[PDB]
Design a protein around this ligand. Structure first.
Ligand SMILES: [Ca+2]
Ligand SMILES: [Ca+2]
Ligand SMILES: [Ca+2]
Ligand SMILES: [Ca+2]
Ligand SMILES: [Ca+2]
Ligand SMILES: [Ca+2]
Ligand SMILES: [Ca+2]
Ligand SMILES: [Ca+2]
Lengths: 88, 500, 321, 450
């Protein structure tokens, strides 16, 4: 149903702290400004989230990109002109 | 005139003669602001918190506090004080409770009243914190039937002025003279929100269950069968208040209420008003007797009731949301030390009115609005219409009176009154001649009659008659006059309940 | 024209007549900004927080708050308020569906004619969305007593508000249509880490959340004869998101119990039900007595459109078509 | 002329001679301020807290403290020391067996005590069963001065949990309980907090404790107690060290300190507590052994020869008990039975008149209005210029007493201790005999410990 964990931020003293941090604060926020994209390779599964602009919002400036470009961005899959390959 | 001894953003000159808040700043009060709705505030210029509550003078006046706090707490003199209690509504081996039973039960009322003190005398004053249970399950049968020879459903009710977050009561359930146990709400009956004049759970929700085994003696159960005088006493309650911080977000964690309780009870006069349905409790500030450094303002009892409940003054009558609570229209129940204080100060007065006496520290005033009342002028909510009344008169105490010469009748069904409750008769009479005679007769569970004689001025009389059962004969009141007699403010007041 | 009495980064003149946010600064509203999708905002120039919710007038107007909050709450007059509850699913061996308006419309009197001008009705048992009553669907006619003839709870928390609730620990009692049984509380493993608006914990597509009591033979008969069980909610304790100077959203310590009696006492409740999903919105309003009060006074029609984000095409309101 | 050595916002010169607080700024005391109701305060200029209590000398004098502290504790010399004691109402044992109690916390100090956590023992005869500390269920949030938790008009609280139920070790306790031995309850220590206004102006009572201050407050003050027969008030008055030249705490007479600790008014020369006179001639004092030797030593070197004119010291203990039955032959005589052979036509009395006795005095006191199994002591003033008459006493009691007294030239107090036992016993008889003509005034009857 849910998972709880931490994330790390390099503080002013140069260390990495994962005590005052939690992901639960951002799960709701990430889910509401991003478009879910999944890639399935038969044995492995990948799940990403790509931000997109609100429909009727004049002060929103999130860039507009196409589905093909977003899949290229969200997986870092190389493009040799037109064909798109992830790991061959 | 911007001197600030206390440094509360209110100049001394404004804080002495009257100040009002406009655009979140304090300005000199002008008499022309009255019709616009701005109120006149007067406070102490040597104290930050005049009433003792955790919010200072400027914060209370401007409203920069929790928005749930009532508008009649914004007066610097009135204080925020969450008067929480616990009322029980289920007996487990149905219940209607009153918050002013233990206070009006201790009063014994005679036929006449001393000239000058038109109030009653009690020696058992108690707050609305306590509870009194009159179980409606009884219909002639006792609880010993069926079972002979642990957890109850209660509801936290607030009658104070400011909300209490994180309610955590500490109550005791009586067992005749002895006790049951000290039960402290622990983890999962801690109400996080208790709005004033509201319960936990909400108004339309069923009561929660108190938590796990207790003993009950059976001998005292027969006493319960003799009479359901079991009452629940809440010894103490714990909670918090809310003050905005530097960033803005309301903090309620370290800000306990219990720090300012022994201070609020020591600088404020306890005033309670009851309307029959719900009861309000307020604690107005009062100066010290012999302290010359005490700059708390002096306001008479008449202004205390207007300020404490945000009453409106129409003509010369205080109106509390339609219901008139003027001195001559309500039945007062003073404490003994409170009463003797007023008595000695009354004979130095001229007008001789209760509401015009100066407020002091330590008073205990319980205002009890009668259930049925008519002034013969504009207000008449009686279940029936009295016979042989002449409204066209000019000698009435406020507007008009009735020209009585003969007998007066009234029909009163038993249904329109609460059964097994003691009631007190009240009214005003006057006769210029003082040669006629007044005879009364009360039709109740007992046959009672009495005679009365008027005086040059309006005089107050008080008679007692109890009620018994739901199915019983209608209560009849007969007034007979020899010659011309004038009446005003004919009242019926709901006193304590009667034993089974 | 630059004076700021409340110090909320909005000049008082702009705040009383109309303003809108462009490039994170307030600009005077004009009629020509309508076709670009902009909205017109009006709030109170004496209060940092007009609605009562934790977010000021500037944070809501500019949107510099949580992104899981509905755009409906970005209006300064509309309060962000997580009205949540518990939805009964399994009765244990029979499932049920839950009606959010059963317990409200049960107390409505309906006649044939109506008085002039007024075209509504009257309710005598008004209740909110947290007041949930079920309706058993698998009860095909056989009595619950059948099966044993001898004299747990699967639930799903639901949100109908505008702002997400983190650390959800709801409190309910088993009222058993007439008398409470146990004031159950969800302590450690039934707590929902986050509960977004118009979403349930667990999300759609997951098995019901299980929460872990005697029942007498008398309740068995009454439940078998035209009665239903409901699980009312007394209170729910959660948290909310606050930004920082370091930039992290901190939702520990911050509570949705400090502001509830502030939001509730200053806002006029408006509720709308589409027959399938229910919404509750709070809209701020002004008390008559106080002259210093500066909360703007607007019609219900403006309050409806600013709460449920309808569309004003012509003179009629369109909500999701 | 505004040096502040101790930095308590009060100048040294004003703090030494007497100062009064007006407009929250201390000014030099003037005798013309007496009629307006201002009070005079004098304290030490080498220490911020004269009595040792948390509140300083400018906070106490101005009243800028918790408002529940009695107005008598606004005087800097008097410590705001709260006294809390637990009193039992009902003790029952039921099946070893469970033991429950009904107790109410009695406060008689001068300042409130928030979060009261009393600690009590359950002892019957020397042998102590266990130590009991107040759990979460029995902690009193607020305990105002001269008030109980629960407040008057509420039932007492139960007590049935001893550690994280009450139970004895064995049946040896119950066997002697039935023999006629009962279990007492005594308090060993009481824990609490004290209110202070923090940096932002609100009050905080979490990090502040009274038990961080008790040891200090006791050691620098002289203990004074007043008993009205029903209500007890315990006060502590700061006193200076004897041999220390740098201890500048003011020296006051015991008579002065009584006016300060109990805030009792003075109608010229007599002292009234709250309508009850507390003048030395009309009240009985009790001192411990240490005080008796000191008070006698100071009296002989002073001409007036009265207790109320002796300078106070550090550590002396005083117990004052008001008379149960007292007559002054001027305005008060509460004895149910009138005295015999009384003549009020005199002017040689201590205050207005004296009693010229010609013969003997016989008084019969009923036992109905007296406490059975209680020890009583009678006091009076006797004057005989002749110094040639012998006076003896014949009083019926549990054991008959017969003592002789020789009156002095001037008035002198006589105290004789006797015991009364049994409610349904012989009526108490009292006889006073005089050889000639004697003067009597200010007769007293006061209860003592049993
Ligand atoms: Ca001021
Ligand atoms: Ca002030
Ligand atoms: Ca009239
Ligand atoms: Ca502004
Ligand atoms: Ca604003
Ligand atoms: Ca000094
Ligand atoms: Ca000093
Ligand atoms: Ca005399």
């Amino acid at each position: 149903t849910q998972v709880s964990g931490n994330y790390g931020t390099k503080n002013s003293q140069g260390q990495i702290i994962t005590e005052g941090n939690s992901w639960s604060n951002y799960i709701s926020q990430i889910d509401s400004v991003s478009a879910s994209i999944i890639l399935d390779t038969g044995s492995q599964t990948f799940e990403r989230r790509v931000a997109a602009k609100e429909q009727g919002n004049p002060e929103d400036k999130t860039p507009e990109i196409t589905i093909g470009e977003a899949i290229k961005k969200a997986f870092s899959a190389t493009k040799n002109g037109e064909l798109l390959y992830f790991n061959g | 005139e911007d001197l600030d001894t206390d440094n509360d953003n209110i100049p001394d000159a404004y804080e002495k003669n009257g100040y009002t808040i406009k655009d979140s700043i304090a300005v000199k009060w002008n008499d022309s602001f009255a019709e616009q709705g701005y109120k006149k505030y007067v406070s102490s210029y040597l104290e930050s918190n005049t009433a003792g509550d955790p919010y200072t003078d400027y914060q209370k006046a401007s409203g920069s506090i929790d928005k749930a706090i009532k508008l009649e707490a914004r007066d610097p003199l009135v204080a925020a004080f969450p008067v929480v209690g616990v009322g029980m509504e289920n007996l487990i081996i149905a219940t209607t409770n009153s918050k002013t039973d233990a206070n009006t039960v201790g009063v014994s009322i005679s036929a006449g009243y001393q000239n000058g003190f038109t109030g009653n005398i009690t020696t058992s004053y108690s707050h609305t914190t306590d509870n009194s249970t009159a179980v409606q399950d009884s219909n002639g049968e006792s609880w010993n039937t069926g079972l002979s020879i642990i957890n109850a459903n209660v509801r936290y009710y607030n009658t104070g002025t400011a909300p209490m977050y994180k309610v955590t009561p500490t109550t005791n359930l009586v067992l005749d003279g002895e006790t049951l146990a000290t039960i402290k709400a622990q983890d999962n009956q801690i109400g996080n929100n208790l709005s004033p004049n509201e319960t936990y759970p909400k108004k339309g929700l069923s009561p929660l269950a108190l938590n796990r085994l207790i003993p009950i003696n059976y001998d005292q159960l027969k006493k319960l069968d003799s009479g359901k005088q079991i009452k629940l006493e809440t010894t103490q309650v714990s909670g918090n208040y809310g003050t905005k911080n530097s960033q803005g977000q309301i903090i309620t964690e370290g800000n306990s209420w219990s720090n300012y309780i022994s201070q609020i009870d020591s600088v404020s006069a306890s005033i309670i008003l009851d309307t029959g349905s719900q009861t309000f409790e307020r604690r107005v500030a009062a100066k010290e007797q012999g302290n010359p450094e005490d700059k708390t303002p002096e306001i008479t009892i008449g202004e205390a009731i207007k300020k404490a409940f945000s009453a409106t003054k129409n003509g010369e009558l205080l109106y509390f949301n339609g219901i008139p609570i003027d001195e001559s229209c309500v039945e007062l129940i003073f404490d003994d030390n409170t009463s003797e204080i007023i008595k000695e100060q009354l004979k130095y007065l001229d007008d001789k009115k209760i509401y015009n006496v100066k407020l002091e520290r330590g008073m205990n005033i319980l205002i009890k609005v009668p259930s049925y009342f008519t002034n013969f002028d504009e207000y008449n909510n009686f279940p029936a219409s009295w016979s042989n009344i002449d409204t066209k008169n000019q000698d009435g105490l406020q507007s008009v009176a009735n020209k009585l010469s003969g007998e007066t009748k009234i029909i009163i069904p038993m249904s329109k009154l609460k059964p097994y409750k003691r009631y007190v008769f009240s009214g005003y009479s006057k006769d210029p001649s003082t040669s006629n005679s007044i005879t009364v007769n009360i039709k109740s569970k007992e046959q009672k009659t009495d005679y009365l004689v008027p005086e040059k001025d309006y005089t107050k009389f008080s008679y007692e008659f109890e009620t018994t059962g739901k199915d019983s004969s209608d209560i009849e009141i007969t007034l007979t006059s020899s010659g011309v007699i004038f009446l005003d403010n004919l009242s019926i007041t709901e006193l304590n309940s009667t034993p089974e | 024209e630059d004076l700021d009495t409340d110090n909320d980064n909005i000049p008082d003149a702009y705040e009383k007549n109309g303003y809108t946010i462009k490039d994170s600064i307030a600009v005077k509203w004009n009629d020509s900004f309508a076709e670009q999708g902009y909205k017109k905002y009006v709030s109170s120039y004496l209060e940092s927080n007009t609605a009562g919710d934790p977010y000021t007038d500037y944070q809501k107007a500019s949107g510099s708050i949580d992104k899981a909050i509905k755009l409906e709450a970005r209006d300064p007059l509309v309060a962000a308020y997580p009205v949540v509850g518990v939805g009964m699913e399994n009765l244990i061996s029979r499932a049920t569906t839950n009606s959010k308006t059963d317990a409200n419309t049960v107390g409505v009197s309906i006649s044939a004619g109506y008085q002039n001008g007024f075209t509504g009705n009257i309710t005598t048992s008004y209740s909110h969305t947290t007041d949930n009553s079920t309706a058993v669907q698998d009860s095909n006619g056989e009595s619950w007593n059948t099966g044993l003839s001898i004299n747990n709870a699967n639930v799903r928390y639901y949100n109908t508000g505008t702002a997400p609730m983190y650390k959800v620990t709801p409190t309910t009692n088993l009222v058993l249509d007439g008398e409470t049984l146990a004031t159950i509380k969800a302590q450690d493993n039934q707590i929902g880490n986050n509960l977004s608006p118009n979403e349930t914990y667990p999300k759609k597509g997951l098995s019901p959340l299980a929460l872990n009591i005697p029942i007498n033979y008398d309740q068995l008969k009454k439940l078998d004869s035209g009665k239903q069980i409901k699980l009312e909610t007394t209170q729910v304790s959660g948290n909310y998101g606050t930004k920082n100077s370091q930039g992290q959203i901190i939702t520990e310590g911050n509570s949705w119990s400090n502001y509830i009696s502030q939001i509730d006492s200053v806002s006029a409740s408006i509720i709308l039900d589409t027959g399938s999903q229910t919404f509750e919105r709070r809209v701020a309003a002004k008390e008559q007595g106080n002259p210093e009060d500066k909360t703007p006074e607007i019609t219900i029609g403006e309050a409806i459109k600013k709460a449920f984000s309808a569309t004003k095409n012509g003179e009629l309101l369109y909500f999701n078509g």
